[PDB]
């Protein structure tokens, strides 16, 4: 009947950026009006499509990628961006066609003692290809002597944790991102507006 956008944005728990979650949106009428009128998103950048002219464009499939990063990394969720999240966690293609939506979630994803449940990848041998997911936990060798699964001299764990506490600056507070990507094949369109 109607696309379950509620299960993505209003989810009780979000995933870490290194293991970002993708939900497939198909065979439903997609109401983007709610997202337009909603004045709670700190980011609503669309690429290849305009958000206004969206309730009249049908697509074969819609994909919603969701994760949590900090404020100064939201700028990396865009085509042609580099840093530590776009290189080791979540990379968008240059010819991206979709929207990036993000909002501040300090009241939910911050613990007073420290929220260490959200993680991000810190080391990797090469940058991620577009829409690639890496969840391996093998020790990253950054030195001459190799690492046999043990940390030490130039042997670090590939995953690191965010602090996520209410006393940080906005640049370090947790932000929930939903990346809506649209694909259009030479096939009947199941998701309209």
């Amino acid at each position: 009947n109607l696309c379950p956008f509620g299960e993505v944005f209003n989810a009780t728990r979000f995933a870490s950026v290194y293991a970002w979650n993708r939900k497939r949106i198909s065979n439903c009428v997609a109401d983007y009006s709610v997202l337009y009128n909603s004045a709670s998103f700190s980011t609503f950048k669309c690429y290849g499509v305009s958000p206004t002219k969206l309730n009249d464009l049908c697509f074969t499939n819609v994909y919603a990628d969701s994760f949590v990063i900090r404020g100064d990394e939201v700028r990396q969720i865009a085509p042609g961006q580099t840093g530590n999240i776009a290189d080791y966690n979540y990379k968008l293609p240059d010819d991206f066609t979709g929207c990036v939506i993000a909002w501040n979630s300090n009241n939910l994803d911050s613990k007073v003692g420290g929220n260490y449940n959200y993680l991000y990848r810190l080391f990797r041998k090469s940058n991620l290809k577009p829409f690639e997911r890496d969840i391996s936990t093998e020790i990253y060798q950054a030195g001459s002597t190799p690492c046999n699964g043990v940390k030490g001299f130039n042997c670090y764990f590939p995953l690191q944790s965010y602090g996520f506490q209410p006393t940080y600056g906005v640049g370090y507070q947790p932000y929930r991102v939903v990346v809506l990507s649209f694909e259009l094949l030479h096939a009947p369109a199941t998701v309209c507006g």
Partner: antibody, heavy 122, light 109 residues
Framework: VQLVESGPGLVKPSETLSLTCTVS??????????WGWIRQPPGKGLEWIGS???????YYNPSLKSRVTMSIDTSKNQFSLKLNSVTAADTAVYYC???????????????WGQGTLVTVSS | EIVMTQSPATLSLSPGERATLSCRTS??????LAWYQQRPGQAPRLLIY???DRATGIPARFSGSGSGTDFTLTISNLEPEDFAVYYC??????????FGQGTRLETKR
């Protein structure tokens, strides 16, 4: 800013030690600072007890985690400390300081209080 | 467990010289470190936060070698009232807020 401690200077063993710190240089309801307690036995090193936020949640030390609770009162602009089942090894000077956590491993105590000496003996 | 070991326990130096306090963390994580100064009967004073940032009101003679695992607090020109006990403090995941054993700085003669 200034921090002042308050509470009985004597506590009998196996009883609760109550202390209240009152600040008078800023605001505890601020969304940028933590409020903690640090103790040190006479002639010994420093030992962080626990830090409390303006909300209600807080985090303490695993050693005294069971026999400790901390509380806050924005109205009176002060935070308190409770240490259950006090033994004779809790004989220390108890400070209340201001905590600032901007990043992740960055947790320093900005301005300390003078501190009160609570001696636990019978 | 991230154990904090300061060195040395006691430091014997005279006014005019420079002291080098060592606060090496256990073979593990690396990030920031805070140094404190405590005089007898006084609350410990914040000297340096975030590896090497002088606190509000610290003379330029204080500095920190905030690098990896092992850290170092350095006092350029030892003043008469600069001899006290110094504590380094970390904030790891578990346990949070570990304190060093302390370095006692005294005047050698």
């Amino acid at each position: 800013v200034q921090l002042v401690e308050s509470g009985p200077g004597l506590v009998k063993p196996s009883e609760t030690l109550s202390l209240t710190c009152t600040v008078s240089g800023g605001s505890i309801s601020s969304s940028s600072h933590y409020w903690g307690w640090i103790r040190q036995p006479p002639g010994k090193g420093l030992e962080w007890i626990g830090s409390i936020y303006y909300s209600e949640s807080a985090y303490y030390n695993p050693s005294l985690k069971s026999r400790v609770t901390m509380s806050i009162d924005t109205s009176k602009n002060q935070f308190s400390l409770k240490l259950n089942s006090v033994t004779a090894a809790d004989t220390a000077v108890y400070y209340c300081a201001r905590v600032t956590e901007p990043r992740w491993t960055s947790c320093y105590f900005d301005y300390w209080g003078q501190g009160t000496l609570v001696t636990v003996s019978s | 467990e991230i154990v904090m070991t300061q060195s040395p326990a006691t430091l014997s130096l005279s006014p005019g010289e420079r002291a080098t306090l060592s606060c090496r963390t256990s073979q593990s994580v690396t990030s920031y470190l805070a140094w404190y100064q405590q005089r007898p009967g006084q609350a410990p004073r914040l000297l340096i936060y975030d590896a090497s940032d002088r606190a509000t009101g610290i003379p330029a003679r204080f500095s920190g070698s905030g690098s990896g695992t092992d850290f170092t607090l350095t006092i350029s020109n030892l003043e008469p009232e600069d001899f006290a006990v110094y504590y380094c403090q970390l904030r790891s995941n578990w346990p949070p807020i570990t304190f060093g054993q302390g370095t006692r700085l005294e005047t050698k003669r």
